[PDB]
Enzyme design. Structure first.
Site, mmCIF file in Angstrom:
data_model
loop_
_atom_site.group_PDB
_atom_site.id
_atom_site.type_symbol
_atom_site.label_atom_id
_atom_site.label_comp_id
_atom_site.label_asym_id
_atom_site.label_seq_id
_atom_site.Cartn_x
_atom_site.Cartn_y
_atom_site.Cartn_z
ATOM 1 N N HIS A 4 -0.479 -14.851 1.402
ATOM 2 C CA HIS A 4 -0.045 -13.480 1.179
ATOM 3 C C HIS A 4 0.701 -12.921 2.380
ATOM 4 O O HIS A 4 0.512 -13.368 3.512
ATOM 5 C CB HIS A 4 -1.247 -12.583 0.853
ATOM 6 C CG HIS A 4 -2.209 -12.413 1.988
ATOM 7 N ND1 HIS A 4 -1.905 -11.687 3.119
ATOM 8 C CD2 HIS A 4 -3.472 -12.875 2.163
ATOM 9 C CE1 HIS A 4 -2.940 -11.707 3.943
ATOM 10 N NE2 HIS A 4 -3.904 -12.421 3.386
ATOM 11 N N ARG A 13 -5.065 -7.996 -1.360
ATOM 12 C CA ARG A 13 -3.833 -8.530 -0.806
ATOM 13 C C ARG A 13 -3.449 -9.888 -1.355
ATOM 14 O O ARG A 13 -2.258 -10.186 -1.514
ATOM 15 C CB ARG A 13 -3.916 -8.567 0.723
ATOM 16 C CG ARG A 13 -4.789 -9.641 1.322
ATOM 17 C CD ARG A 13 -4.963 -9.446 2.839
ATOM 18 N NE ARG A 13 -6.332 -9.057 3.173
ATOM 19 C CZ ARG A 13 -7.082 -9.656 4.093
ATOM 20 N NH1 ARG A 13 -6.603 -10.672 4.791
ATOM 21 N NH2 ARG A 13 -8.328 -9.258 4.291
ATOM 22 N N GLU A 28 -10.286 -14.606 3.158
ATOM 23 C CA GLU A 28 -9.809 -14.785 4.527
ATOM 24 C C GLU A 28 -11.072 -15.073 5.340
ATOM 25 O O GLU A 28 -12.180 -14.944 4.827
ATOM 26 C CB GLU A 28 -9.148 -13.497 5.022
ATOM 27 C CG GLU A 28 -8.697 -13.511 6.474
ATOM 28 C CD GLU A 28 -7.636 -14.553 6.751
ATOM 29 O OE1 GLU A 28 -8.009 -15.727 6.916
ATOM 30 O OE2 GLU A 28 -6.432 -14.201 6.795
ATOM 31 N N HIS A 46 -5.289 -16.888 1.533
ATOM 32 C CA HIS A 46 -5.086 -16.442 2.909
ATOM 33 C C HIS A 46 -4.773 -17.562 3.887
ATOM 34 O O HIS A 46 -4.908 -18.750 3.568
ATOM 35 C CB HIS A 46 -6.337 -15.709 3.381
ATOM 36 C CG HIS A 46 -6.805 -14.666 2.421
ATOM 37 N ND1 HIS A 46 -6.473 -13.337 2.547
ATOM 38 C CD2 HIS A 46 -7.504 -14.771 1.267
ATOM 39 C CE1 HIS A 46 -6.945 -12.666 1.511
ATOM 40 N NE2 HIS A 46 -7.573 -13.515 0.719
#
Ligand SMILES: [Cl-]
Lengths: 240, 243
Positions: free
Chosen positions: A9, A60, A87, A184
């Site tokens: 992202h 995200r 993440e 991520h």
């Protein structure tokens, strides 16, 4: 040969606020959103089509998935979300400002729990401004006392990522389904390392481009028959 | 008591073009999109939270789901898409203009295969303008020759909807998971009929508001304990029920 596509992202709201995000659900910034659009256009032009998608449980990353599916007109695709693609948990550094943090503990210290393979940042204490915000969130209501991290080292991240890749993703690939993973930096690093069989040093120096489609072509053993490939105009693929 | 929420998608691109959509993947119009946003905020204000979501494989429905999840900050929810929740297949009328169609066949005829319960529309012939765009779409690669319709009566639609509701949705509800279904008028009618046990005539007289959250409270037998409730400003509700 199998075809796998990854996409990290782009810029988040806390990114341009230069704060550590980790598990905080920061959303994409307009540039981050736009980035996912151009990356989406790229797949569309290339004529790529998938069968199933995987992503984390963070805005995200998910929004990035949505923006792409829309662009390639494949919103009907089956989507699977999992905290295992999240993440890395920045423990107590979450929310802090990367700059102020280096000025306070010294760049050397900061560099460490940021580019280290096994150095966990300090834990996230019950008083941390984001403790209940992340620790007490339905999202992870089905996670064991352990599983819910207080902080994570890239090694920690990978340890809880691969189990998913092996048990959930690999099977789909072996079934000949074109997979698309929208996640991520740190969680995607775990896949790359496993794929290319990189050393600990190797992945610490690897920085995956954002919003750019990362293409892999695997052999009958899920082994990259070649280096990763990027999609988009040369002026951009060059920049990578 | 269990809590189920339904939401019919709003205005599509072909809606303001007054064309029959059916299985054609028309996307939401800006008003249709805005319409979802508002419904979502209604849920947000009410404090609703879900555990899993179901939707069809059509843009207009899915986008509605996305817009809502964003509004209630629940994009992480598990989402399940299925062709069984698709709009009713308008067969050969797909793409045609509702007005020109009535002028060519007479309002009486049109009224029929639109508010009828067991009378399907004319089949979609292989020479249809959208025959391949729809019949040959990857989305349905796994459907058996029979499953893939060339047209559907509201009855046909329901026949292929409920199997999913029974086998896929009911289990989740019985497991105490707050479900959210974002679909179409005809597919949602099948659920409503099954829930309230309506007659064919009754169901044919029911027009679900669009972009407005429809809330149901079920008992242990998944039977409603009160009439359906709508969410939003009293004016918003009023205005919607009229259309
Ligand atoms: Cl989704």
């Amino acid at each position: 040969a199998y075809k796998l596509v990854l996409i990290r992202h782009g810029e988040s709201a806390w990114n341009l606020e230069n704060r550590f995000s980790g598990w905080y659900d920061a959303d994409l910034s307009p540039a981050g959103h736009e980035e996912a659009k151009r990356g989406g256009q790229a797949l569309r032009d290339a004529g790529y089509e998938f069968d199933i998608c995987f992503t984390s449980v963070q805005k995200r990353a998910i929004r990035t998935l949505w923006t792409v599916l829309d662009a390639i007109d494949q919103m009907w695709l089956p989507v699977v979300r999992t905290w295992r693609l999240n993440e890395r948990h920045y423990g107590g550094l979450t929310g802090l400002n990367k700059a102020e943090t280096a000025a306070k503990h010294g760049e050397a210290q900061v560099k460490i729990w940021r580019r280290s393979y096994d150095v966990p940042p300090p834990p996230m204490e019950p008083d941390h401004p984001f403790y209940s915000n992340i620790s007490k969130d339905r999202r992870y209501a089905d996670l064991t006392e352990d599983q819910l991290p207080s902080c994570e080292s890239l090694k920690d991240t990978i340890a809880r990522a691969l189990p998913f890749w092996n048990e959930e993703i690999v099977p789909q690939i072996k079934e000949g389904k074109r997979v698309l993973i929208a996640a991520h930096g740190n969680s995607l690093r775990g896949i790359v390392k496993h794929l290319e069989g990189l050393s600990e040093e190797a992945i610490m120096e690897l920085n995956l481009p954002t919003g750019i489609p990362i293409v892999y072509e695997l052999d009958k053993n899920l082994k990259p028959i070649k280096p990763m490939q990027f999609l988009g105009d040369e002026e951009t693929v060059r920049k990578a």
